[PDB]
Design a protein around this ligand. Structure first.
Ligand SMILES: COc1cc([C@@H]2c3cc4c(cc3[C@@H](O[C@@H]3O[C@@H]5CO[C@@H](C)O[C@H]5[C@H](O)[C@H]3O)[C@H]3COC(=O)[C@H]23)OCO4)cc(OC)c1O
Lengths: 211, 505, 52, 83
DNA sequence: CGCGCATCGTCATCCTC
DNA sequence: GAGGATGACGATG
DNA sequence: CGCGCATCGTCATCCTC
DNA sequence: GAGGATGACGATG
């Protein structure tokens, strides 16, 4: 019981996997973001990348896999999952608390939520599940610039210290069809976020206006 | 045969001891190649294919199990493959597999690596240079599962035990050998090859800025980097080796932040400026506490001085026995002599073999010339009659087969290669190329007969250093591209201290 | 004969499989079971124990 | 034709030999022709006519080649005949 | 490697009424 | 200065 | 795939004395 | 006879 009493009033020390930011829960929380990554491999990429931006307005928390759908599920099953409980405990949401005024948003410990996953269909499914989870119980939060997405390239080319990024296969197909001197560049497919290196992560977080 | 019962004495002195011997064989490195059988199987499988492009780790482990006859589970092998590629501070001063992907940073104990299917790998440029391609014939192989399999060791041009360390726990024996610097090893080998006396060395690491102190033989102390920014703040720049940022934080900053059962909260604020390679901790505390820590010693307060010993120098031998080594120079001299014994073997193997290849080319050229002359008539002639005509000329069998037989010592005539050449060889455009090729082979054989085996090692060392220059240049450029430029760059006076008492045992 | 682990490795090597060897080994096992209720015909011979 | 002694390839330039070979009626690789006809949806090609080793210049192998071509003709006839 | 929990559409029961 | 306790590590269950 | 717990010999600290 | 609840299965997180 004494240990449980200590457990409170110290940010969220319940989960070791969480990498809390500096101003999380304190002042200027409206700008403190939070990065959600799928699995655990993407956590390595996010942590390796945060070396350049900082530790004040960014925090990383790894997920597990397919998030439980909440639009049609028993309340008991909702209480059973611990990952959702950790998500609420980190963010600070409340079930029956409407968020209409900006002060209600200021009450929370994090300003925005940036989700990043693989550039495949499975990441798209996970993002959809998260959007459904947020909309099912907080419709008002979807009109204040609260959620955002981080994207990565899916294939790169290389020839004489030159590279061209591509995010979608239709764009890569268009580049192949519209450009001569094709196949001179070395093709390299990217499937998982862990495939990228430290230099690529630094280049990704350098161009924030594109991802 | 049939066994009604089994005595415990025979049960222990005949079966469990086999497990002990196998465990010692698979958990202790060798003084010759500085590797273990698990690492050796992967390194051989990678040598079998060229692999000009990259390759996935999962398919690589599958190929290793396919050819190296590995029978211990792919899961235990993927971790070994990852261990053979890490290059961060504290892991390995030199790597054999290029790090394409994320092979674990210096934050979560190296266990934060991605899934094996997420990462790629490829042999480094230094792999084929340390192991010359002309040494496969020198060593002895095994025939597990009726299959040509990996050898028992390898012959590099540097002692691999002293460059990548060796940490293993076995039965009755253990291994613990720290790292060293490659340039010092090269200088010592070059000094010993002439005949001079080797110099004492010190365990070093790549990309490390902490201080190392030697007090007693086979004992060392390592100190990190601390600075005083202001009369209130303090900065920690570098932690010693065998220390992880997450573990150091959870085991030092957390106990110091809040008051413990018997100590008041010493530190007040701590902030982290972490990167992939360098760390930066900014701690704000009380000025009186800072003066107290200075009076006591900052290294002792924040646990920066770490000791290490060297008393487990146990390795195998060229025969297979174990020895308790005492000094690094002993390992260096033993490796030097073992390497010196094989120059004659390599020279005697390459000689004779090049001569036989040249003789085979000469026989093929003579056969082509005689056919152009029109003496040899092969039209509608029986194969047996043709062989009877060919032997009386002086033409012999395949010399490559002769060397293979001479090596294997420890259906009649053979003239297939003299008739397996297509008709394209019956033109002058190809006859000229064959003539120039045989002349080149004669020149190579003459140069080999003229040169001396020992100087070849120094040549190989020159090439290895020339390649290492480009390798380190690329490694530095990797950080130089990462170099942000504008960033917090706190600078402060540095306190360097040593234990007042050696306290030698 | 051939081992299942090396077989999955070769499949990922040539078939361009990008969904994890663990999800593929279960499929390889499913393509070999021949007990009552599983498959009236199999394509891979059951050498070993493929589940009762 | 080579056994007859009409084709002389001793120290003869590859291109000159091709020029002599084409005028005979010899064509390129039909396997390459089918591959091209399938792919529809560097000059002449006579590599396979010179990639045969000298072992083929004996009657012991000429008889085997003759029987093999006869077997291929029979197989083609059976295919043309069957349904 | 074993159990850890998730989607997604039909449906055979399974517990009330 | 003098003794017991314990986790640290790596290939495998 | 992540955490789950085990051997086995040396030893650097770590908690009493 | 008439309605809601729920786990069963398989390739993938
Ligand atoms: C834990 O960390 C991660 C896990 C995953 C999931 C996963 C998720 C799970 C979970 C299990 C699994 C597991 O699947 C299981 O495999 C088992 C293999 O033996 C057979 C007998 O039975 C299978 C289970 O039917 C299946 O459920 C993983 C296999 O590969 C994956 O992709 C799976 O139980 C709890 O949630 C993805 C990640 O990032 C992408 C992770 O970081």
């Amino acid at each position: 019981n004494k240990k449980c009493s200590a457990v409170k009033h110290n940010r969220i020390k319940g989960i070791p996997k969480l990498d809390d930011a500096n101003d999380a829960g304190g002042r200027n929380s409206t700008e403190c973001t939070l990065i959600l990554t799928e699995g655990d491999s993407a956590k390595t990429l996010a942590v390796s990348g945060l070396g350049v931006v900082g530790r004040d307005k960014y925090g990383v928390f790894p997920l597990r896999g397919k998030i439980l759908n909440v639009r049609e599920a028993s309340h008991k099953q909702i209480m059973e999952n611990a990952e959702i409980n950790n998500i609420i405990k980190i963010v600070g949401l409340q079930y029956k608390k409407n968020y209409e005024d900006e002060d209600s948003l200021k009450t929370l410990r994090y300003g925005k939520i940036m989700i990043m996953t693989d550039q495949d269909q499975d990441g798209s499914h996970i993002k959809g599940l998260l959007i459904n989870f947020i909309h099912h119980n907080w419709p008002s939060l979807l009109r204040h610039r609260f959620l955002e997405e981080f994207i990565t390239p899916i294939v790169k080319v290389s020839k004489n210290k030159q590279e061209m990024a591509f995010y979608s296969l239709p764009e890569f197909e268009e580049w192949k069809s519209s450009t001569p001197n094709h196949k001179k560049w070395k093709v390299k497919y990217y499937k998982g976020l862990g495939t990228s290196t430290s230099k690529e992560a630094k280049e990704y977080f350098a161009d924030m206006k594109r991802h | 045969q049939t066994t009604t019962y089994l005595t415990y004495n025979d049960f222990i002195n005949k079966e469990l001891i086999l497990f002990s011997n196998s465990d010692n064989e698979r958990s202790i490195p060798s003084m010759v190649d500085g590797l273990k059988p698990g690492q050796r199987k992967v390194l051989f499988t990678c040598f079998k294919r060229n692999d000009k492009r990259e390759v996935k780790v999962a398919q690589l482990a599958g190929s290793v199990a396919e050819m190296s006859s590995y029978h211990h589970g792919e899961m235990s092998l993927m971790m070994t493959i990852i261990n053979l590629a890490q290059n961060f501070v504290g892991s390995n001063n030199l790597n054999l597999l290029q790090p394409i992907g994320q092979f674990g940073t210096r934050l979560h104990g190296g266990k934060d690596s991605a899934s094996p299917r997420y990462i790629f790998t490829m042999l480094s440029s230094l792999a084929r240079l340390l192991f010359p391609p002309k040494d496969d014939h020198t060593l002895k192989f095994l025939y597990d599962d009726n299959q040509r399999v990996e050898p028992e060791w390898y012959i590099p041009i540097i002692p691999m035990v002293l460059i990548n360390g060796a940490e293993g726990i076995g039965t009755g024996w253990s291994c613990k050998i720290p790292n060293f610097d490659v340039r010092e090893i090269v200088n010592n080998i070059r000094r010993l090859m002439d005949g001079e006396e080797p110099l004492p060395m010190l365990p070093s690491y790549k990309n490390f800025k902490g201080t190392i102190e030697e007090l007693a033989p086979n004992q060392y102390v390592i100190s990190g980097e601390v600075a005083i920014l202001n009369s209130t703040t303090i900065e920690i720049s570098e932690l010693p080796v065998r220390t992880w940022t997450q573990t150091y934080k959870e085991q030092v900053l957390e106990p110091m932040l809040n008051g413990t059962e018997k100590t008041p909260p010493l530190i007040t604020d701590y902030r982290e400026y972490h990167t992939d390679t360098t760390v930066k901790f900014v701690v704000k505390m009380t000025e009186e506490k800072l003066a107290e820590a200075e009076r006591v010693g900052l290294h002792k307060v924040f646990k920066l001085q770490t000791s290490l010993t060297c008393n487990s120098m146990v390795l195998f031998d060229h025969v297979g026995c174990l020895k308790k080594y005492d000094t690094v120079l002993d390992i260096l001299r033993d490796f030097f002599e073992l390497r010196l014994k094989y120059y004659g073997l390599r020279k005697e193997w390459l000689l004779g073999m090049l001569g036989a290849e040249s003789a085979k080319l000469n026989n093929q050229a003579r056969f082509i010339l005689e056919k152009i002359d029109g003496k040899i008539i092969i039209e509608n002639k029986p194969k047996k009659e043709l062989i009877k005509v060919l032997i009386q000329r002086g033409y012999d069998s395949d010399p490559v087969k002769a060397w293979k037989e001479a090596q294997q010592k420890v259906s009649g005539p053979t003239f297939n290669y003299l008739l397996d050449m297509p008709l394209w060889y019956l033109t002058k455009e190809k006859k000229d190329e064959l003539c120039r090729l045989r002349n080149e082979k004669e020149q190579e054989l003459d140069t080999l007969k003229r040169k001396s085996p020992s100087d070849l090692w120094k040549e190989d060392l020159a090439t290895f250093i020339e390649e290492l220059e480009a390798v380190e240049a690329k490694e530095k450029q990797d950080e130089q591209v990462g170099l942000p430029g504008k960033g917090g760059k706190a600078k402060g006076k540095k306190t360097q201290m040593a234990e007042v008492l050696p306290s030698p045992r």
